[PDB]
């Protein structure tokens, strides 16, 4: 078997967002270069609203 857990089922996805989300869900079952944690923001601006 190539994979212990498949990265995703090819039939379930319908667009690129779906495959990105499936990768983000399944990444815990693979060796990760950087284990995810809280993200840190350095630049953030709010535009004026209607």
């Amino acid at each position: 078997k190539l994979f212990e857990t498949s990265p995703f089922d090819p039939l379930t996805i319908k667009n690129n967002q779906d495959v990105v989300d499936k990768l983000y869900a399944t990444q815990s079952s693979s060796i990760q270069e950087v284990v995810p944690t809280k993200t840190f923001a350095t630049e953030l601006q709010f535009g004026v609203t209607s």
Partner: protein, 774 residues
């Protein structure tokens, strides 16, 4: 978060008679009541906000109408027929009925294929999808303009990462991105930075107090490792000669060493080394003693020169000279800095000089300071390169104090005590400067450059007692950075980022309001009355319902003690007639576009600017394209009728009139007002007449009643209707033809194109490029 709009918001309505001879297409944008005597641009903007809300345009969005298509049954036709807009089936049915009236044959097969394939979706060179559909002109223009304005802020992920690459600190862990988010990642972020300097400059002490309080509440909880006070006291007592039987000066020094307020002094030190100019002063006792000399020496030696003001320097020198030089306060009241320095140096005291701290540049860019380099002062006047005090003769000066004679010709009690105390303080600072430097750097990473250069301590709330200063320098603690402290600091960094962004947005909104509302002020009364009334109206309106201003801004304005409305009112008044630059956001451009089109194309929104009233017995050129019977629409208002110019009257003069019968016996064009009107196009045939009378005469004045046309279609051979129109109606009201009305025959002008971006784009909600360490 971008909103994907699944359908194009067309507003085409097809109106056809029961006979089917006539048909037309109309744009429905609604009727908006417009007033007279007030400015039109303000009402235009007020209506433009609602119009944008109606079209799903106000909030940021992207178009996702590419997938709304089907394919024909025939095998040659591979074209993608779009399902949006006015469906070609409706136009086909209307045209078939129109040809059924005229006894013409129905549309052929080839004509049916030509018509039913008009609305189509085709790919574009770069991957976008262009959909051609039947839609109105106003909706098309507004939607396309809004699409462009919002597209101005959508940028690829790599470009955003490049833009924010300078500000990423070294210690945090880089965030891996999926390959799709690199090849096809797009982010919607505003990249203009709003200056916070208006608020900081207008009310300096409120902002300074708020930021200082938050920073010190943060700093006070830093864990430290400190040597026991009793152990240090024992060491000092052994160093000098300290005995319990005989009173001594060392006992006075070591009798009031308190560590209770150590965190406050620690936070004050961090604040002094963090900002560009943060003054601190001490008030010594009326009768100075050795504690006061120790504290003054500590301030002069280890506090930064920028922190000490010239008056504070003079006061410290005066206290030192009073203690050590056989003099009173009244002697040195008129003495300057040079005389005090010479007096203290003649007796042998060398600690009479201020010392400038040495700046260290931050590794990464300060936040909200594009293209700038930040710096902070190193604590305790220690040069990072040499790892010692800036003064290179400090050991020699301590030895001089040791061998000197102060307050007594014979005996070195004061000199020995002060030398021992100063040596202990110097050792503690030299050992512990590193942790304080690290803490100062980190807490400096939280404030931008505008706050670094602008914030000042003017309330004098944060002072240090002399006992606290000498105790803090004698029993200096080693700053220890734990993981929990770093995590809390990260949380506060996020909080400060959010609060800075909210402050910038609030400042921009306030600048826009003060530019749009209040004009110049004058020395004349009545102008002051008008300004006060307008200020009260503005404050009352902005604070009602959801407050315009954020809660953090209300907090920083209130911190003085005002009610929240008063502080905002004062700040708004202070901003009248500013020169601060402002940025035109996409939403402002969209509202300006919609308001300009509202002002220009008045017929689309149910109001005109001139009307005409003339008797039924005078023939009038009319717009006969639609086929209405006695159509109240003219292509343009007649300049000349029956060889003579048509009289024009302003609404005011017309209302003021008293001989309206004579002037109405001929008919006239009313102008200088915005006439709101409405119409109900009925499918059947009938007499075209208004719901109400044209005119109302009162002893006060004359008015024009609301206009509601009942439009019916026309059958030429109808003696009853012709006679009723000729005889029953005596006067008629004519307005310019609405631009939303459009015949069915020229339907090809309703064809319009909308472009939607590629479906392969993936959108990143959190564009952060780095992960927290733990």
């Amino acid at each position: 978060e971008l909103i994907k709009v699944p359908t194009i918001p067309h507003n085409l309505v097809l109106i056809q008679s029961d006979n089917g001879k006539h048909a037309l297409i109309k744009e429905d944008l609604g009727q908006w009541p417009v007033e007279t005597g007030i400015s039109l641009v303000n009402q235009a903007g007020v209506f433009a906000v609602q119009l944008a809300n109606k079209l799903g345009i106000d909030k940021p969005f992207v178009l996702d109408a590419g997938s709304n298509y089907f394919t024909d049954t025939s095998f040659i036709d591979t074209r993608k027929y779009c399902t949006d807009g006015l469906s070609p089936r409706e136009i086909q049915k209307a045209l078939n009925r129109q040809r059924a009236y005229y006894d013409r044959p129905e549309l052929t097969i080839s004509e049916n294929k030509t018509l039913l394939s008009q609305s189509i979706i085709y790919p574009d060179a770069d991957g976008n999808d262009v959909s051609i559909i039947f839609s109105g002109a106003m909706s098309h223009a507004i939607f396309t303009y809004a699409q462009s304005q919002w597209n101005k802020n959508i940028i690829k992920l790599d470009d955003y990462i490049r833009e924010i690459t300078l500000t990423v600190p070294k210690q945090y862990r880089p965030r891996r991105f999926k390959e799709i988010e690199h090849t096809h990642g797009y982010v919607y972020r505003e990249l203009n930075q709003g200056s916070l300097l208006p608020l900081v400059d207008a009310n300096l002490k409120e902002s300074s107090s708020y930021y200082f309080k938050k920073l010190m509440s943060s700093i006070s909880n830093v864990p430290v490792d400190a040597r026991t006070l009793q152990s240090a006291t024992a060491a000092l007592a052994a160093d000098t000669g300290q005995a319990v039987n005989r009173a001594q000066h060392v006992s006075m020094l070591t009798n009031r060493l308190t560590t209770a307020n150590a965190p406050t002094v620690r936070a004050i030190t961090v604040l002094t080394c963090m900002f560009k100019q943060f003054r601190i002063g001490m008030t010594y006792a009326l009768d100075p003693n050795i504690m006061d000399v120790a504290a003054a020496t500590c301030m002069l030696l280890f506090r930064p020169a920028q922190s000490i003001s010239d008056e504070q320097y003079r006061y410290c020198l005066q206290t030192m000279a009073v203690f050590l030089t056989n003099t009173t306060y009244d002697i040195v009241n008129n003495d300057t800095i040079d005389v005090l320095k010479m007096k203290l140096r003649n007796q042998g005291w060398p600690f009479v000089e201020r010392y400038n701290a040495v700046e260290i540049d931050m590794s990464v860019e300060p936040l909200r300071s594009p293209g700038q380099v930040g710096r902070y002062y190193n604590p305790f006047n220690i040069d990072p390169l040499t790892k010692k005090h800036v003064e290179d003769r400090l050991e020699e000066f301590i030895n001089q104090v040791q061998v000197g004679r102060f307050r007594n010709a014979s005996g070195n009690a004061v000199g020995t005590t002060l030398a021992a105390f100063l040596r202990a303080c110097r050792d503690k600072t030299s050992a512990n400067w590193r942790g304080y430097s690290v803490l100062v750097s980190r807490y400096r990473s939280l404030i931008p450059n505008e706050l670094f250069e602008s914030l000042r301590n003017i309330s004098g709330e944060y002072n240090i007692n002399p006992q606290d200063e000498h105790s803090f320098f004698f029993a200096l603690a080693q700053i220890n950075a734990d993981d929990e402290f770093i995590g809390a600091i990260d949380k506060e960094s996020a909080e400060y980022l959010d609060e800075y962004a909210t402050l910038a947005r609030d400042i921009s909104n306030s600048l826009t309001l003060v530019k749009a509302a209040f004009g110049p002020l004058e020395r004349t009364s009545g102008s002051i009355i008008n300004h006060a009334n307008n200020l009260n109206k503005v404050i009352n309106h902005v604070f009602a319902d959801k407050p315009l201003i954020s809660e953090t801004m209300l907090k920083i304005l209130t911190i003085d003690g005002t009610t929240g409305k008063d502080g905002y009112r004062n700040w708004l008044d202070k901003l009248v007639g500013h020169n601060y630059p402002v940025y035109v956001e996409p939403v402002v451009n969209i509202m300006n576009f919609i308001s300009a089109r509202f002002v220009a194309d008045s017929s689309y929104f149910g109001y005109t600017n001139e009307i005409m009233i003339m008797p039924n017995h005078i023939n009038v050129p009319v717009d006969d394209r639609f086929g209405f019977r006695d159509s109240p629409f003219c292509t343009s208002l007649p300049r000349t009728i029956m060889g003579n110019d048509v009289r024009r009257i302003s609404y005011n003069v017309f209302s003021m009139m008293e001989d309206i019968d004579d002037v109405i016996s001929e008919g006239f064009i009313l102008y200088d007002a915005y006439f709101n009107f409405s119409y109900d196009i009925m499918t059947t045939d009938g007499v075209t007449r208004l719901k109400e009378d044209i005119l109302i005469v009162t002893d006060t004045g004359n008015d024009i009643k609301p206009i509601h046309f009942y439009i019916y279609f026309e059958n030429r051979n109808d003696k009853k209707l012709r006679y009723e129109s000729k005889m029953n109606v005596s006067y008629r009201l004519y307005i310019k033809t609405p631009a939303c009305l459009l015949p069915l025959s020229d339907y090809m002008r309703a064809q319009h194109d909308y472009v939607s971006p590629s479906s392969s784009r993936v959108y990143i909600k959190d564009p952060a490029v780095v992960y927290t360490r733990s």
